Design a protein around this ligand. Structure first.
Ligand SMILES: O=C(O)c1ccc(-c2nn(C(=O)c3c(Cl)cccc3C(F)(F)F)c3ccc(Cl)cc23)c(OCc2ccccc2)c1
Ligand SMILES: O=C(O)c1ccc(-c2nn(C(=O)c3c(Cl)cccc3C(F)(F)F)c3ccc(Cl)cc23)c(OCc2ccccc2)c1
Lengths: 263, 262
């Protein structure tokens, strides 16, 4: 049990690190998605022709479109892992944990966080890409061939439901921290100090949601229930990736991701 | 939304019905398991199973041993379904829901609730059966042949972790109600009143845990996380059943029995 002032201080700390760690915040993604701004309008990729113009317009190849787009998602997921790793080190107590457990917490946590933060970039019609300079439609992603089309759509299915909670970045900063400090990850050596940190973070989250969303009934519980789903959604993802990996030979996985998916 | 007085009234309402609905409470089960109550009859191997079904005549195991015990678990689960169904009717607002939604909520909820309440009857060493008159050891269940041994042990693995929360019956009564009133069951027609009731139940559970376990930090959060496991555990359970159905040919019952257990 912490005191209110300590819990608000912890919320403010985590929000600050989150802003420092993640280049594209949910506040900026929503500004882009809502538009009504000449300067932040994305280029929209909705078919083959617009994808080609996008590579010349947005900028920042011998392969089939579905693979090209897959490698774009994995390239960006690897960067996400790096950004999450940097954020986690700022969580008070994280770097003090047993080093193997730091690895284990990141190993089982990054996917759940990527899904969570991917929602920030999504609405029911598509997803921001290339730091918000681009927008790729859900339809175009869903129409990709073989197993790639159905591989993309579940990320959207989760996001629409998650976005209905209407969390902002200051809420997400603590929620992401709670996910990382999960004491039930397989193979953890010292569960107790991880749970002590999470209890502080859960207390921090509970008060943050009560202050930021005072009219949102049992948002804390509903958000914890979302952390339930993610576990199975991540399971379905990893299953699909392994099946695709066997069929598709022109699919490479970044060694960082390769190691994460081992057991 | 709700007032403290209303949340306590709802907690006590649910506790009273919980006691009426289920034959063997957790409080009574713990007294038996700890040896602090007539020793229950112990089934620890093949021969003691025979003596118990001849002396007690356990209604679920009245063919191969592993299949006999497997189907006994189904018989009791079917009884549990009716007990949970009757309990659900005592949840304020439940009987007023659309009839199809009551059916849907019960259909997709009973598995999670049976697992939850099975923990009340279990310790790391075994499980109470026949309203506590019997105790079947974990070791004997785990050692059953082919997939049946592997079918039993996950239930103990879950139960041991769940029991570490040290919930009592007054906590479980609300928790079970929260599970039933889940707004994400496939095919629900009117989600809004289901979530409205669950929100009331969540408030009652939260206050119940703070009053009943004032020293248990974030027990509310930890218990909601257990509803994580339950979802995945039930899915692996159904996958485990399908493997048995295809693999095992000695599972055949009378077609009427298959319908009852369908
Ligand atoms: O910016 C960001 O923060 C971001 C985080 C995630 C994705 C993204 N990953 N992804 C995956 O499948 C995936 C996940 Cl979730 C986790 C781990 C590994 C993988 C992978 F290795 F398998 F790749 C997606 C599937 C569908 C969609 Cl729509 C998005 C993702 C992301 O795509 C941006 C993007 C979209 C379209 C084209 C190019 C780039 C961005
Ligand atoms: O009294 C009670 O409250 C009770 C609730 C559950 C069981 C029990 N079910 N079970 C299942 O597999 C199962 C579950 Cl969890 C959920 C849904 C459907 C099924 C099923 F339909 F597939 F059956 C078990 C597996 C292993 C064990 Cl040890 C117990 C259970 C119960 O066994 C009593 C018993 C123990 C040993 C032999 C015979 C009977 C009692």
């Amino acid at each position: 049990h912490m005191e209110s002032a300590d819990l608000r201080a912890l919320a403010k700390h985590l929000y600050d690190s989150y802003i420092k760690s993640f280049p594209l915040t949910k506040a900026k993604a929503r500004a882009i998605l809502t538009g009504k701004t000449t300067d932040k309008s994305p280029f929209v990729i909705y078919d083959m022709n617009s994808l080609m113009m996008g590579e010349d317009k947005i900028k920042f190849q011998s392969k089939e479109v579905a693979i090209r787009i897959f490698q774009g998602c994995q390239f960006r997921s690897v960067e996400a892992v790096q950004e999450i790793t940097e954020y986690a080190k700022s969580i008070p107590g994280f770097v003090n944990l047993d080093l193997n457990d730091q690895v284990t917490l990141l190993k089982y946590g990054v996917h759940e966080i990527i899904y969570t933060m991917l929602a920030s970039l999504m609405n029911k019609d598509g997803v921001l890409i290339s730091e918000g300079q681009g927008f790729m439609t859900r339809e175009f992603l869903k129409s990709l061939r073989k197993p790639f089309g159905d591989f993309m759509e579940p990320k959207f299915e989760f996001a629409v439901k998650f976005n209905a909670l209407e969390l902002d970045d200051s809420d997400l900063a603590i929620f992401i921290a709670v996910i990382i400090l999960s004491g039930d990850r397989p193979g953890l050596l010292n569960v107790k100090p991880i749970e002590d940190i999470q209890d502080n973070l859960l207390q921090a989250l509970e008060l943050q949601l009560k202050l930021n969303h005072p009219e949102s009934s049992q948002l804390f519980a509903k958000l914890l229930q979302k952390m339930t789903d993610l576990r199975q959604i991540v399971t379905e993802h990893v299953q699909l990736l392994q099946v695709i990996k066997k069929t598709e030979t022109d699919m490479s996985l970044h060694p960082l991701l390769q190691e994460i998916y081992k057991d």
